[PDB]
Design a binder for this molecule. Structure first.
Ligand SMILES: *[C@@H]1O[C@H](CO)[C@@H](O[C@@H]2O[C@H](CO)[C@@H](O)[C@H](O)[C@H]2NC(C)=O)[C@H](O)[C@H]1NC(C)=O
Ligand SMILES: *[C@@H]1O[C@H](CO)[C@@H](O[C@@H]2O[C@H](CO)[C@@H](O)[C@H](O)[C@H]2NC(C)=O)[C@H](O)[C@H]1NC(C)=O
Ligand SMILES: CCCCCCCC/C=C/CCCCCCCC(=O)OC[C@H](O)CO
Ligand SMILES: CCCCCCCC/C=C/CCCCCCCC(=O)OC[C@H](O)CO
Ligand SMILES: CCCCCCCC/C=C\CCCCCCCC(=O)OC[C@H](O)CO
Ligand SMILES: CCCCCCCC/C=C\CCCCCCCC(=O)OC[C@H](O)CO
Ligand SMILES: CCCCCCCC/C=C\CCCCCCCC(=O)OC[C@H](O)CO
Ligand SMILES: CCCCCCCC/C=C\CCCCCCCC(=O)OC[C@H](O)CO
Ligand SMILES: CCCCCCCC/C=C\CCCCCCCC(=O)OC[C@H](O)CO
Ligand SMILES: CCCCCCCC/C=C\CCCCCCCC(=O)OC[C@H](O)CO
Ligand SMILES: CCCCCCCC/C=C\CCCCCCCC(=O)OC[C@H](O)CO
Ligand SMILES: CCCCCCCC/C=C\CCCCCCCC(=O)OC[C@H](O)CO
Ligand SMILES: *C\C=C(C)/C=C/C=C(C)/C=C/C1=C(C)CCCC1(C)C
Ligand SMILES: *C\C=C(C)/C=C/C=C(C)/C=C/C1=C(C)CCCC1(C)C
Lengths: 296, 296
């Protein structure tokens, strides 16, 4: 099927390759199989299931709230491209050092990373404002993906360096995202809302932590995983990272806004020390509206 | 110098190319000259001058303020890479459809685009908070660069579509960046500070507007410009876009903070209508502290 040169002859007992002078790019590296039929079949099923969840979340959101729909919007456009051109350039980049780079994956990431991280900075949906910390989250997260993408495109010691630069940026991201979830927990009402925030934290750190692991395991790292193998791994963490997290997000948002509809915006002053941080604790009791220095 | 296959023989009257079976990638497309010695010489001079300005801005900032230093930090690391590996993968990506993509350029852009756009959302340096508009600026700007990068990696009608998707995102970015500059102008004190804001607006829209123009003109578009040609064009708008704009930014910041040191934080309520917008006008007179509905 390929639109690089696939036909060649071996000459001088396979020491010389002869190709048609038809202007096409040529590299043996590009023609290596993407994996077993079983791996491919597994990958095509999880992709349809991802298309189904992407489709239902969008229509569901159809019945503020812009960050969840967008991630599902980008996810549906991703599947139409996968369906028609999954391994066609530039969904996959076939480069001169022999690498296959899944640009489709990294592009989606850079497009939605501000959307997801804005949403991280807006769990309750009540804020109109974003602090200095939000901005450090976006700068560090974009750096991570840019160094990572560079590492995927490189080889040898150059790949090692850019991966390590991605990790330094990534640690800063994880560290600060952890504080946000802590503040969110002590901001939202005491019941079901704190269960959902806790659920979102687990999904976030498991799914986000798995991406550098799948990088090291895939063709971009030690080549342990095949390309279909990598696809399957990515579909699982993709469903968690995007669809499910936005669904939990939308759910949380509904719950918080309904709290304002029933009890109203009753804030508090929980002074945390996880440092000397502060928080406005939404409560269901008008009585409760005081400074609660809960040093962690 | 290249580390893809550069040596080949023509056989059957140039209808067959024979190459050593040494595992190297091969494409005639990759070997096309990058331009004239004159273009190259011009490009190497502007790069050193860019290194010099990057070096002086950094040391100058050495005598809040994080966004300007970072852009100069990234710019210096860019020049050390240019010096050693300007046309080596993945500073340039040589891909299977024959394209040469200057990943070095787009990577820098994605890394600093949040930094610059945060700084756009913080001209005075007094704000601790960022509105919903800032967040739309970051989402739209990153989309622009991602669609653009995809367009550079593609060919034919696929390149046309992604470029057009980049333009749609880009228009949203320009439109909203214009409002920010209008608000900044009516926020800062009446004298020299409004000259600098006006200077920053001109630099911003000229330099940012030139990037899609250089894309259409370069190998990524209609191939009018050569690679050295493109480099020279990029060095000129690079000096404006990064060094000079951050220098004007730092200057503005100093002026505003010195206003608080002399007169103090004396805000107003200029209600704009460029819609029904509002602004806190810093003034040098304690007397002036009222609502001035200046409908534009
Ligand atoms: C043809 O190329 C092949 C490379 O496989 C050569 O075959 C092998 O030769 C080496 C000896 O240097 C042995 O170690 C291997 O056992 C051989 N067989 C295989 C399957 O690898 C062969 O010598 C070459 N012929 C000429 C004329 O150069
Ligand atoms: C060798 O290939 C060349 C291609 O350049 C052929 O030369 C040309 O042949 C065509 C005729 O079909 C003419 O229109 C051109 O004027 C010729 N010269 C050039 C410089 O292009 C040549 O015919 C081929 N020989 C064989 C045996 O196939
Ligand atoms: C913060 C998130 C938590 C989890 C994050 C996991 C950290 C991974 C680090 C491992 C160091 C090992 C070096 C990795 C360097 C990558 C380069 C590489 O794989 O190169 C391929 C090789 O040259 C050809 O086989
Ligand atoms: C908002 C900023 C203001 C200024 C912004 C300028 C707008 C550029 C649009 C031009 C439309 C023309 C179509 C451009 C499509 C690009 C694809 C391309 O160049 O393809 C190469 C071609 O196939 C091989 O020669
Ligand atoms: C876990 C992956 C999803 C379920 C397995 C589907 C699949 O690929 O199974 C085909 C079978 O192994 C025939 O070779
Ligand atoms: C987001 C990332 C998407 C990558 C874009 C994928 C677009 C696939 C285009 C397929 C292509 O290259 O088309 C070849 C042409 O159809 C035959 O001549
Ligand atoms: C330390 C590793 C480098 C991490 C990458 C850079 C950190 C993000 C940044 O630039 O934020 C600084 C800002 O001043 C925060 O208030
Ligand atoms: C923080 C202090 C400034 C140093 C920053 C990064 C060093 C890496 C620079 C990138 C060099 C890549 C060159 C290569 O990989 O060869
Ligand atoms: C404008 C470009 C900078 C000045 C020209 C430098 C340059 O390249 O000039 C070499 C000369 O043309 C010898 O062929
Ligand atoms: C930011 C973007 C930088 C691109 C990274 C450029 C890094 C250049 C590495 C050069 C390379 O590929 O090294 C080949 C090796 O030195 C010979 O075997
Ligand atoms: C319209 C073109 C598409 C522009 C790209 C998307 C706009 C950015 C966005 O998602 O922002 C919406 C947000 O709700 C703003 O308040
Ligand atoms: C807003 C409404 C939703 C449609 C969004 C974008 C359409 C383009 C999708 C990208 C398809 C690329 C496929 C290709 O280029 O082939
Ligand atoms: C599409 C949705 C999500 C949440 C995508 C996330 C991607 C990452 C968290 C990637 C992280 C990387 C790290 C931490 C370091 C190695 C390079 C990566 C870009 C793979
Ligand atoms: C390094 C500093 C700056 C300011 C880089 C800016 C880059 C752009 C403004 C690129 C814009 C593009 C547009 C508007 C549409 C075509 C694709 C581009 C990515 C080239």
């Amino acid at each position: 099927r390929m639109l690089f040169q696939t036909s060649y002859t071996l000459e001088n007992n396979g020491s010389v390759i002869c190709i048609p002078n038809n202007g096409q790019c040529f590299c043996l590296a590009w023609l290596k199989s993407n994996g077993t039929n079983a791996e491919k079949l597994a990958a095509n099923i999880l992709q349809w299931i991802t298309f189904a969840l992407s489709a239902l979340c969008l229509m569901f959101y159809g019945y503020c709230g812009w960050e969840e729909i967008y991630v599902a919007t980008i996810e549906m456009i991703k599947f139409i491209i996968e369906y028609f051109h999954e391994f066609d350039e530039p969904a996959v980049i076939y480069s001169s050092n022999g690498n296959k780079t899944v640009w489709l994956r990294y592009a989606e990431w850079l497009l939605t990373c501000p959307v997801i991280l804005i949403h991280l900075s807006n769990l309750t949906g009540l804020a109109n404002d974003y602090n200095k910390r939000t901005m450090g989250l976006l700068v560090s997260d974009i750096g991570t993906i840019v160094w990572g993408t560079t590492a995927a495109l490189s080889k040898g010691y150059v790949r090692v360096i850019f991966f390590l630069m991605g990790l330094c940026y990534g640690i800063y991201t994880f560290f600060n995202a952890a504080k946000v979830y802590i503040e969110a927990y002590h901001t939202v009402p005491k019941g079901r809302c704190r269960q959902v925030v806790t659920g979102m934290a687990w999904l976030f750190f498991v799914s986000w932590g798995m991406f550098p692991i799948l990088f090291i395991l895939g063709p971009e790292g030690f080549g342990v995983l095949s390309v279909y193998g990598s696809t399957v791994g990515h579909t699982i963490i993709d469903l968690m990272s995007k669809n499910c997290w936005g669904l939990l997000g939308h759910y949380l948002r509904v719950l918080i806004h309904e709290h304002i509809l029933i009890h109203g915006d009753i804030r508090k002053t929980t002074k945390l020390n996880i440092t000397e941080i502060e928080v406005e604790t939404l409560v269901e009791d008008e009585a409760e509206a005081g400074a609660v220095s809960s040093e962690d």
